[model samples]
Target: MNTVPFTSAPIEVTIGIDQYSFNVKENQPFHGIKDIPIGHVHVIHFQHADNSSMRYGYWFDCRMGNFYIQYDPKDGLYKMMEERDGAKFENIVHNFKERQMMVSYPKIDEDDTWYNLTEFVQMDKIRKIVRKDENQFSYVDSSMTTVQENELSDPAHSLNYTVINFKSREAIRPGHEMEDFLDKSYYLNTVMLQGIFKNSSNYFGELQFAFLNAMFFGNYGSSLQWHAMIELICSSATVPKHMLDKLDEILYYQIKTLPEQYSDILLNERVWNICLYSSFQKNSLHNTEKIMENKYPELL
Candidate 1:
């Protein structure tokens, strides 16, 4: 895989309305400050050139919110900018200093701010890295210094898997923090699921398990669950063709023919299915397996 060449010069980053620059060495993490009116915004950067060409990390704006930004060579600018409200700069900095590990960066563009460049990623070398050790697949970005080999494999390490799951429930429950919690959970879940899907085919079984869990156990009202489910169902090779057909039938029938009560659940699933079909049709793998055109003709 092509990696970004680390340079001594600092890269420019724009957070909200202000701009700052920080130097991040290849395979090294950088934390610094950009002085603003209120105080200083903490800047975090992990140049994960070894794992990915994309620079990963976040900026904690002291006055406003925490922002995660990444560089996109295709656009010649840093895209996928995400802002997290109620994020404590001190806590984030402390975690970096004490834990020596960074949180996973967003990889998918869910909106104008959050952008994904994974479709442009070359995985030949990444596959080789995973083959050398299954543990290496857990290192999604440079923010994480060291990860247990079983981190992704284990269900107990809830930080990576269940953090969003909990927040998802908080959004459903009666609470003033529901909106903020839901928004964060939605974005985080998207990033987490996409990261898993892109990491390796070995995770397909795990992805399927997670998908089923999210569907039945998670907040059914959350669109994020359906989004992950659609992506997993569409992309997974292990999922039986008959299962896909059955899902298509349910989503399609409910969308076109169901009543208001039925629409509540199936409508979002149908929209997600349409999105999955559209994205799937464009994938390189689609060239080899042209099943979407026949399987989801209604979406067309």
Candidate 2:
């Protein structure tokens, strides 16, 4: 019988000590920010929500998953309808100009920016590094650092690769004394994911997993880091179905667990939005429409 070579000598990874999930130990409220294990690798299970939206809930500890974003018709429908009717023509035109401006002369955030893409990447070199020891890894950009590793593993093949999830929820609205430092940590992870994905197939592939850690522990990203990730998969992946499904599971599970705090975005018409909606329990267009009006002027 033949055994997989890489599997037998799988790389070991080490996550940052600070990024451990705050809700690791159940029945315990508030795992003081400082006390939270930031670097430890944890297993995260993400179940895409049935309702269509960008929301996805995942767990970070032994059983970890949380929602990312969900699909509400308000947000999803508006975008789709607009596209269908050519209403966004003007905006798309405007965005084209903005996109050009962004590409031609990108803004500089000295800490995170890279002058040249070619100079910053090394596919084989990175793979070798990961192969050497997957136990722990780190990626650094101009500004911050990203790290990840296997938090716990058994001799048995069952394993978990919990992403050291980070967020700047408050940063989205910005301009507050409370914003503290720019939540660059999550941005870093976004960049790292993109960097690695750029080199592999859709995120479901084995190579994608390899690249994922590179990003979890490597350097990359600006403020709209997550947005970049969304775009990358949409454009690069041949089978966007898997991406859509995983995202759906993430959102559905989150809403089911925290419906009071989370809103629905599952009824929109866009592909991603439809995916979100498909995951939800009830197919109420009314609830989805109501949610969209509040979330955006247009949905998609």
Candidate 3:
């Protein structure tokens, strides 16, 4: 409940590439929650440098925009703002131990909104949009086709052409030859595997498979290429030897039954995939206590 003078100079803040100065009025007192330490809650008044009438107030953490509540000057009250995906805000509460403001918005009803800031934007809607647009062309199809054909026919494209032709030949031929070719083609496999790993961490459960499957068929490479990075990382010292080895074993099993486990990326058949949990489940799955138990069992 600590208050500061309203006439104080505005504090310069930057989010992403946008920069602005806000006249910080008050540091509202709040409690800490979970691991968040007791910190100041800043209610800042922001205005256009040239036009004072165009102004707004925001309640956020002193550190950054972790949790934010905006005051509707028109309504003469604070109303939760809606995210791009139509998630309307419900309420804000201070985390006693973390000293930060937590905003909550219920998916169902305003009455169902919890005091704790558990969820933010509606991710399911965002994901649905992504899935629907994944196959849609972002650029003019003719232009993209021309560019691709030009790249393939470039004078220096000889090396790439040979490699692609080889893989295409192997893919058409029967047996595991296609898999062998994909495994050996380091460049192609590296790109494909990198994408899978990237999306694996960002997405979760069945959603992850959706992204991977999209990339797998939409882009180049094969299932063998998708799993190549496991061996590459395990063989390298990028991570602890024991940890990498354990991960290699676990990933090997996952890959062995990948076809069955991910038979239907649409269906929620499996709890965890190669990257463990989706981004949503990462927090609960990788909590300090659980990590210590699995990675450092001796200490536990």
Candidate 4:
């Protein structure tokens, strides 16, 4: 039978080149209208990947964090996240039903906050913790609110706002690891970065910075020096006020470089409410060869 969504089954989106498949909950909604809640696009199997595959997804936002994924290509398996605030994934999902493709976001729960903004901290510990209890929570579990160490707790708050001498998780916060890494490196040179990011193919601009930001400033289990290498490259990177304009273009035109009327920000509040998927950019979901229909395909 065809992969049908909403049956509470596990939806396996296949990759022809790899043995692993990206699995989203069969019940997870696909939002084409209203808000695309954060943390909903959750989980991946990591049997074939490296240790870093564990860094993806989370559960804490307001009460419990929302569900999300961390991504990578090593073993190329992605991991579902548990609490705030980061991971690395290259993604593409398609829902070609209503003469349009569906767009679900990579964020949720705190569907309202930029947890990775300068104000936040490194999203490391919970990633390790999430791996042990993985996927069993494909349906909601009793825990989401309590600040249990292994279960879902607020990483944003736990990483940033806690008071126990203001530190219980022994947490580390935002991008300074980039600065710290460069300072620690014995050789004072720029040539080394070319070697590190050589594997990155076209790692440039904010994508480079964002990747390094998560690699260095985001997750855990990776060594400090490892992040230092990734951090060394992203030493610089944003904008604040005009972000609303760009978000609209992707959500509407599903493309960049549009006219002023098509690219507007006057509806900032409404626009902010929606979160679109990363696949919306630079991809035509029409390639069913590389893209397959998802199972639990409708939004709640």
Candidate 5:
């Protein structure tokens, strides 16, 4: 794994929530999206392990404190009590059908009052504590070594979010080709779009939706978003034709320029599953492979 050392300074600010005042450091990675001054904050949402919904509101401004939003198990929207002044908000919700988070935010240019974002710290603690009581949460794994520390460990050291994002980014179709996309300006936009796409899916099959939710929504997991991006290209029902044309053009470029470095990952068949399922019908589902077989049997 590529390691880039970055410093995290303790940021202290009051944003109405009592629990959010804990001393924490922020690290800006070299390659990941950072330093975007795009007018508003980014809101990410997730569902707790117990099926409760939650949101994490991230902003570029340090003046406005970080916000956490989630469903109130008791009153439904009671967690929205963390709202403060001079803050803009965004909303992200998990779509169980698609196994992704659907994102929406306040008008960037519009001067709107910041409303009460939800607070899920207590609920999260509660869920964690309860899981501990039941011995439901296990740290042991055969794939990777578990950290044996008391203090909160850096999430990047684990295979959960870090590995997910790394693998997904490795498979990202047009990462190095676009100079603008590599820059922060378009990077943030692309990240936001990918986040929205991930949260928009509703089909949560054998995957642990809660763990996936915490990884992506809780810990800046980019793999979920990357997978979602690939899914969108395959299943997109209404993307602009020009965008598709551009993607095809980009793929052609990859084929011509970097075929050896990007051969196996490109033209992957898993992407077709998205398009197939998105446009699936009861009668035609069985013979779906037939269509691909006639066109490109090697892909299957």
Candidate 6:
């Protein structure tokens, strides 16, 4: 009897003091994909619990199984949404071009002023440092630092590695926030990942689970960060005859089917809608125009 080599050693990933068993191998891929790892804006719209009329929501892109905070579009969609998170939200946007994390009043009368969210990023708490061997690298992470710019700039240096910096969500204790808000923000994504692991074949299940363990523990943003993470997860395993596929049948199904089945309870399409919909009881969209409405609506 031969046991699989990939399953022999488990990878222990460290995050916030928790050691998750994330083996570097022992995972499967979809459709026997030749190349490694890889959206529709499914806006999960909703009303503020305190003010029902004030709409807020987020975008859950199906293509990548990624979620984004939909800006409070009340001031009229800035062709984008607004998220009122504090420092963390304010900080992460800087890593992106003005396009992806563009922060401004949704309705900007003077559009050019705050093209960059960096201006509002308070640098008071972040440290400033310097070193002798430097070609001048601005920005610092505090704690006596060293610069690497004197050497020739090389892509090879980064090709083998991935970088992710998890920030502190110190706004309040995790449990102190509104129950529904907390559940929607943290619970739903992890729950969906739970479903993926349950439905996937044993090997691929491990890969997806590894992602959940790393991603859910702390918040990080940008396609660069998550994209690199996905690639890292993909290359972590050696390819098998069963490893490649166009998509994971079960996971992709979750993306395609779930969004189509749900609709807002109030039926008011004008609201800033959210994806808190359900298919249970009389809540199903069987008789509703959700598909039609989602289709007929202007491109998001």
TM-scores of all models?
A: 0.21, 0.23, 0.21, 0.21, 0.22, 0.17
Q: Looking at candidate 3, what is the lDDT of residue 4?
A: 16
Model 4 compared with the native: what TM-score?
Answer: 0.21
**On residues 46-80, what C-alpha lDDT tens digit does candidate 2 reach at each position?**
11223222211111221121111112334321010
- lDDT of each residue in 109-227, candidate 5, tens digit only: 45222211111112322223223232212121112211222122443333232121212353344645344322322322344335422322211110122222323233223223334
Clashes of 2: 85
lDDT of each: 0.33, 0.27, 0.27, 0.25, 0.28, 0.23
List all candidate RMSDs to the true structure: 19.0, 25.0, 18.1, 19.0, 20.1, 25.9
Backbone-clash count (model 5)? 19
Ranking by lDDT: 1, 5, 3, 2, 4, 6
Better of 2 and 3 by TM-score: 2
- The deviation in Å at residue 105 for candidate 4 is 5.4
The TM-score of predicted model 1 comes to 0.21
What candidate 2 gets wrong by more than 4 Å, as runs, is: 1-40, 43-223, 235-240, 251-300
Kindly list the per-residue Cα lDDT of model 6 for residues 140-253, writing each as its tens digit.
111111122212233222211112212224212366455423223222123222332232233233223222222222111121232332232232222222333311232222
List where candidate 3 sits over 4 angstroms from the true fold.
1-64, 69-185, 188-300
Whole-structure CA lDDT of model 6: 0.23
Worst 10 residues of 4 by lDDT: 160-169
Ten-residue segment with the worst summed lDDT in candidate 2?
1-10
**Overall local distance difference test of candidate 2:** 0.27
How good is model 5 by TM-score? 0.22
